[PDB]
Design a protein around this ligand. Structure first.
Ligand SMILES: C[C@H]1C(=O)N(C)C=Cc2cc(OCCOc3ccc4c(c3)C=CN(C)C(=O)[C@@H]4C)ccc21
Length: 127
């Protein structure tokens, strides 16, 4: 009945690189989903204490959110765009694992997921 610590977002021992796929992911992909009307429940880790969700982290063992993804992006944590995408894909799937199909938070996730997929359907070819 406590929050876990957040996922790792910095590690200086990890190699850094700037590519156009990571920049796209931040500048286009994360911007877009961040400012979307449904983004608000996903901009930080599920606060299972504040939200009164003791069982959240009894069911979700691989948590992820768009704030952790920002901190990862901005902190040059990712080497591969697919590491980012998987994180976005964990975010959604966690929502679908925890919540009841068809409620509101799942509907919210499904439209953000459709926005995400579209943008990723034409991520930049590596320059
Ligand atoms: C009709 C309308 C309404 O009546 N009003 C007033 C306006 C908006 C409004 C909002 C609503 O927001 C629902 C959000 O519910 C949840 C459920 C579960 C979780 C979250 C949020 C938070 C984060 N995450 C990622 C989770 O997975 C946890 C477990 C629903 C209805 C309305």
């Amino acid at each position: 009945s406590m929050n876990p610590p957040p996922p790792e977002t910095s590690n200086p021992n990890k190699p850094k690189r700037q590519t156009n796929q990571l920049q796209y992911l931040l500048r286009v992909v994360l911007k877009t989903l961040w400012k979307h009307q449904f983004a608000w429940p996903f901009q930080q880790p599920v606060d299972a204490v504040k939200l009164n969700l003791p069982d959240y982290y009894k069911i979700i063992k691989t948590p992820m959110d768009m704030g952790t993804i920002k901190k990862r992006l901005e902190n040059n944590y990712y080497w591969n765009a697919q590491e980012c995408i998987q994180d976005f894909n964990t975010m959604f799937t966690n929502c679908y694992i925890y919540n009841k199909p068809g409620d509101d938070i799942v509907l919210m996730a499904e439209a953000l997921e459709k926005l995400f997929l579209q943008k990723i359907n034409e991520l930049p070819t590596e320059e």
